[PDB]
């Protein structure tokens, strides 16, 4: 009922303490595991099945040991009369006996023992005799006041049982030369070489091993000193991990060339080791692909797709700040304040850090160009973290406990200052913020990464498109396993130069359709041209274009400046007064999505054709173009139907003016909560769904995802929210709503495809879901894809 | 009888339940000649001759003809006139009709020798202006010559109309029938009864014509077996002496007086009164001169309304002593006279209670609501312009153009028309006291509309073409000027801005209006509460019938004083908890001053509080930001650094969506913590004053259980403290709004926590459809035009999505909490279509604002009935 016996070839429980399910399982298998008891009179009773499987209750020297579901009291049961294997050993064992009973059970510091043991010695513990031991344990006999076996178990069961249990028979690795204790994993947890892993410590106690008093001897002499034991813990080990079918971390102690197996738990690994481990145990036949695939975790795969920091705890003393881990991996170089100095310092070959408060479309320039990136403001899906994730680099968002002086050319944390120049580093994954200049792990020249992946990739069942708006970041999502574009921003497409910049602002503040129709006119040869080189790049591919979903404010650059520099990129009176008809108290729902093309189908005629002009094109340059037109921030059918009757208008005259008729799709993003509620009336009219997740859980929450961090934080540490719901779908809401639309779109349109281009679509847990929903693929920032990739395979497998 | 029914005074061979043989129009002919009226004998040829006539070869069939004829042969004998006879003429009109919808000719049977006799009794000039218009639409119609080719020759002569003789005219009609051979090659045919044997022709011709039948099949009219034929005697009121035409209502349609109400005309014609030419005259004139008819037309309008139990317009004309019903159409009518015409034909048993309440519409019911012009066509010539009609009722006053003016003019016993370009939340005091608000811009939704809308205060917004110079003290309408003090009226329900001092409508001895009340309050299932944030606007609230207050906006509780707006502002500004508790103290005794103001106007009603929902950005003054650092420091104290950062800190970029709501009150407990109390010490304070209080207090912007769990805990908190302060304990209820999507996708959680949810619709529109509410009209109108909405989701509710979610939450709390009470206080609550949904969806109550509650409390009753 309560007490779980185990001992040889015999064990009352099993795998399914935290040791006293691992000490049975262990020794059902087989394996010399020294016979015990697990608590949950009773003790007596399994006290005897002990006793007799050792043929003692003839001495009997016992340890209590605490283990949980998620200290220890060596040679209990020791006095004057149980004091057959030599006096050193034994009276070594008692002094051990005293220190460590009173210690762990009546509470005398380690420090009073110590004292007495310096003060005897000599040089080496080694060398001391039996006689001096002898003396040693009176010493530690007087620490006591300055004996029956019974009593000690009970006050050492009540003792450990303070903050299961386990008590097991003693096995000495402090019986001489041939005998010792050790630790080992059974595979490189930090490169994951299948050759055994540890160290071991003859004639010493079993943590003398780790505790560094004295210094461990490599498993090589053991081989050569003790073949014997050695021997059978070579075949132990491949015995451990043949059960499993995993790498094992193991404790084991040798007395007198018998060896025994005390703990084992699943090796904790690298990313580099989790993937080749995973990899060879599938070569060798111990593991399927299946169970490959879970046993690299998403973190594992991240560690592995960009740089990292040799070793972070090497660095603890280093850390002057900690923030959000806006976009995963490591980052090194010299502290830098403004976007223009990033890009100049990387032409020039510096690395530079980016620090600000804050950074805007105008920074995107520096942003590509900076190592990595340190803001003092903005969350985890702010537009700083989206571009950093999508690029692979490093970013550290919201810092609080930063001041930036951006006129000083410093920042401060907390009464340290750290100028311009000085050398930092950043860790995108923990969010550190480390003085210095530190080390990063070199890259893995492995094809173990590429093989497991493509395991994951013949695994999973949806597909994993990419957000990509330039042919530049299309090549290097499809580089990462992209199966496509799942959504170009076209709004997104205009950053590159003052060239483009003028033009786009030439179009926001259009007053006159003369005035619009000249910008409309100057802006296709952009579109056209970069929607082009990303045709070529996805050959072969789907490619959803959106049309334009701009925020009017972040293209506007004191007030006389915004309207000087307007003027030169109209009159003074029709900037003044466009500024002040595009403000908007709430823009995020105002003036944007499908709603400015349906006002001016003038602006969706020009993208339309740019894309078929661009189409058309390539085609005709031997490229396969699948192209997809999606409408933004539909609402209701009308709306989706007006731009569709335009799209087709286009495509009548683009195919006809060409001479070449291509076939294309067309579809809406599912981003407003009404879309879902009547998503039966727009799945009859739409080829496709993309779920904007982004502004859907802005809309079914009421948060504004600028000004969230106001709360969000409250909100969290009172379990008013168990997640970011911009990070973590919101299954029971969100989610409904998904469902909602998934459902009644396919059954008013069989024919109907269903996909995720929102933030969510490369976190993990939230890809899980979609997959149990039914979508059909998930699209994702080029260098998210293959996180995607695992995990849409993991949930499946 | 078998293809022709004839009708008319005293004939009636059809009847109302014969649409699909006669016409439809064919149908009510009979029936109106049945029931006694004075009806111009005719005949009607039914759609079996048409469908014959299309299986004969498009010919008249046999044996049809000798019916006409014999139907002919009644309206001759009935009309002592005969086809062709000048010194007796008849002339007939010929209209299509089919049972459902789908051109007239006049003067049939007019020809050379004809004219001649119709100008003996009607004039020289008219009846060949008669013979001439005649000849175009017969040889349009039916013989098929355009209309653009007789306007030549008129112009032509006119070259070498009201200004041309009678012997013009005959010579112009030369003109009209060459037209005929110098287009179809045959000659105007002169016989009138070829002339209506062609014209019935015509008419079975122009069944199965194409645009005809596209009509039909694009529509799909089911089951059509053709047209019939109606031939009515024609009827003159210019024919001498003993003629005229007129017109009248049955009861006045201004007041309801049960008393004939009209115009009459001797000798002349119907759009002789029309044109003006000469002036009408009182129906008393037509009881001297000719008593037979008029007695006949007493009998006819009691006849009227005892078949369609509603007061009538009709059209009369009398043609040589004999009357004659033309036309007939229910009477509209001013709110006044719907009311009592209402009510007076319920107590005469004319209808029942239950059609009275239909009858009144909700418009109508509005127009008793606010005060009235007394005549608004009387001030035509004084509209200067018109704009939008923000919010409704009649306002009179002299220009001002500062809200501190309008304050400072209203203490005097001066009546303010406050006029500016827009309103800022600083003129709340001096909109509160102006007679009337007129802004330059914004639109049905801007700050001057709301507030208006809420104190039922007239108010004309988005005249475009003023522009006000407050500094100058004047605005411009184009070159006019209208300077401060100038008499200017409002009409805040149609937008009208007009000029000088117009006569205000007298109050009424409407007794009649409590009583069609008391029908539609004894019939509604739905209660109306009230959304009202003040003690006067709760008394008003009850005073329009509200049963409760379904809304108090804290918020909105602090416009009143320089002293209250500078407490919130501390509270705002407030940086460290030791500002905040100061800011707090100072607003203790408001909150808890006004809910007993409340509380005291609600007494023996449920009161519903809301938790602060505030406009942060609102709080803080206007201009420029150096000025609203400088006043804010005035108010606060801080240093000028400090404010700086603190209005930096509190910016939102969407603060619709920011920093509000329970957001706040969770954040910051001390500031629930603070309300609640002023709540509970309110109500005992009342209480302990005979008061019978029914508190309820509302969390806002809920969208998960743990919110609203988390202030139900501090209000629960705070009732103990106050209860064992006070010694006395009261029942209350804790609720939530429902202004979120997800709080009704997971309503079933909520619903455990919640005695009560209220439909916030304005926010709940908002996050469905992503329109912000303030700047949604960058594109609403385009949207509305486009066909892509049909309707302001702001003001109607929508169904399909909104809607989908309000039946969900219902439904899900119900079934979590069947006790759960379940309201609306957005602002579709007031609006009438949107009422009716709610009770359908089994809704408990409707919150509206004050002056609203009578139009939702008859809306609530006209969809039961
Ligand atoms: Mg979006
Ligand atoms: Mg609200």
């Known amino acids: 009922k309560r007490v779980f016996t185990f001992g040889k070839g015999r064990s009352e429980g099993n795998r399914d303490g935290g040791k006293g399910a691992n000490l049975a399982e262990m020794s059902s298998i087989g394996l010399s595991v020294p016979p ?142 041939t005998s010792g204790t050790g630790v080992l994993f059974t595979r490189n947890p930090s490169t994951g070489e299948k050759k055994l892993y540890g160290e071991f410590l003859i004639n010493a106690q079993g943590e003398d091993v780790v505790a560094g008093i004295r210094t461990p001897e490599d498993l090589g002499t053991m081989e050569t000193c003790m073949p014997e034991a050695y021997k059978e813990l070579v075949e132990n080990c491949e015995i451990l991990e043949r059960h499993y079918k995993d790498m094992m971390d193991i404790e084991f102690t040798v007395q007198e060339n018998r060896l025994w197996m005390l703990q084992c738990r699943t090796g904790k690994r690298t990313g580099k080791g989790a993937v080749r481990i995973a990899v060879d145990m599938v070569n060798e036949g111990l593991i399927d692909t299946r169970t490959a695939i879970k046993r690299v975790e998403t973190q594992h795969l991240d560690q592995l797709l960009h740089p990292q920091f040799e070793d972070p705890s090497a660095y603890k003393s280093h850390v002057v700040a900690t923030g959000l881990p806006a976009s995963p991996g490591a980052a090194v170089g010299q502290v830098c304040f403004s976007a223009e100095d990033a890009e100049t310092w990387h032409a020039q070959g510096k690395s530079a850090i980016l620090v600000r408060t804050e950074t805007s479309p105008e920074d995107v320039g520096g942003m590509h160009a900076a190592a990595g990136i340190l803001t003092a403001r903005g969350g985890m899906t702010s537009h700083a973290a989206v571009v950093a994730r999508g690029w692979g680099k490093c970013c550290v968002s919201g810092c609080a406990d930063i001041r930036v002086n951006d006129d000083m050319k410093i920042f401060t944390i907390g009464d340290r200052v750290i100028k311009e120049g000085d050398w930092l580093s950043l860790n995108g994954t923990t969010g550190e913020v480390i003085l210095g200049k530190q080390l990063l792990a070199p890259p893995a020249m492995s094809n173990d990464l590429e093989i497991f992946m493509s395991w994951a990739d013949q695994a999973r069942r949806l597909k994993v498109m990419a957000n990509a708006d330039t042919p530049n970041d299309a090549l290097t999502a499809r580089n990462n396993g992209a199966q496509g574009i799942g959504l170009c921003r076209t709004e997104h497409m205009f950053f590159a130069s003052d060239e483009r910049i003028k033009a786009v602002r030439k179009m926001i503040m259009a007053v006159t359709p003369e005035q619009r129709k000249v910008a409309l006119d100057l802006l296709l040869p952009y579109q056209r041209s970069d929607f082009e080189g990303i045709f070529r790049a996805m050959d072969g591919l789907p490619v959803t274009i959106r049309l334009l979903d701009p925020p009017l404010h972040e293209f506007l650059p004191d007030l006389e400046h915004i309207v000087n520099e307007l003027a030169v990129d109209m009159s003074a009176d029709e900037i003044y007064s466009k500024i002040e008809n595009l403000s908007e108290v709430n823009p995020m729902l105002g003036f944007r999505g499908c709603r400015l093309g349906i006002s001016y189908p003038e602006l969706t005629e020009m993208q339309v054709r740019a894309i078929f002009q661009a189409a058309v094109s390539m085609t005709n340059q031997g490229v396969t173009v699948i192209p997809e037109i999606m409408v933004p921030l539909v609402g209701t059918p009308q709306e989706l139907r007006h731009q569709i009757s335009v799209i087709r208008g286009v495509a009548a005259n683009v195919f006809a003016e060409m001479g070449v008729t291509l076939e294309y799709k067309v579809g809406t993003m599912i981003e407003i909560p009404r879309a879902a509620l009547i998503a039966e009336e727009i799945g009859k009219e739409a080829d496709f769904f993309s779920f904007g997740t982004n502004d859907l859980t802005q809309m079914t929450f009421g948060y504004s995802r600028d000004d969230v961090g106001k709360f969000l934080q409250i909100y969290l540490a009172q379990g008013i929210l168990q997640h970011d719901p911009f990070e973590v779908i919101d299954q029971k809401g969100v989610g409904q709503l998904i469902k909602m639309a998934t459902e009644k779109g396919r059954a008013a349109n069989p024919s109907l495809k269903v996909g995720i281009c929102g933030e969510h679509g490369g976190e993990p847990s939230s890809v899980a879901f979609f997959d149990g929903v039914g979508l059909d693929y998930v699209s994702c920032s080029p260098f998210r894809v293959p996180i995607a990739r695992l995990a849409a395979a993991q949930v499946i497998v």
């Open 36 to 177: 015990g008891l697990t608590i949950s009179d009773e003790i007596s009773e399994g006290l005897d099945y002990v006793q007799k499987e050792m043929s003692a209750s003839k001495p009997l020297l016992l340890s209590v040991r605490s283990g949980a579901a998620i200290d220890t009291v060596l040679n209990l049961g020791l006095n004057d009369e149980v004091v057959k294997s030599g006096a050193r050993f034994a009276y070594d064992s008692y002094r051990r006996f005293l220190d460590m009973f009173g210690n762990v059970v009546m509470g005398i510091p380690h420090s009073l023992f110590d004292e007495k043991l310096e003060q005897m010695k000599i040089h080496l513990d080694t060398d001391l005799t039996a006689a001096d031991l002898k003396d040693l344990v009176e010493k530690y006999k007087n620490v006591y006041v300055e004996t029956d076996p019974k009593k000690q178990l009970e006050l050492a069961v009540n003792a450990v049982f303070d903050s299961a249990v386990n008590i097991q028979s003693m096995v000495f690795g402090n019986m001489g030369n």
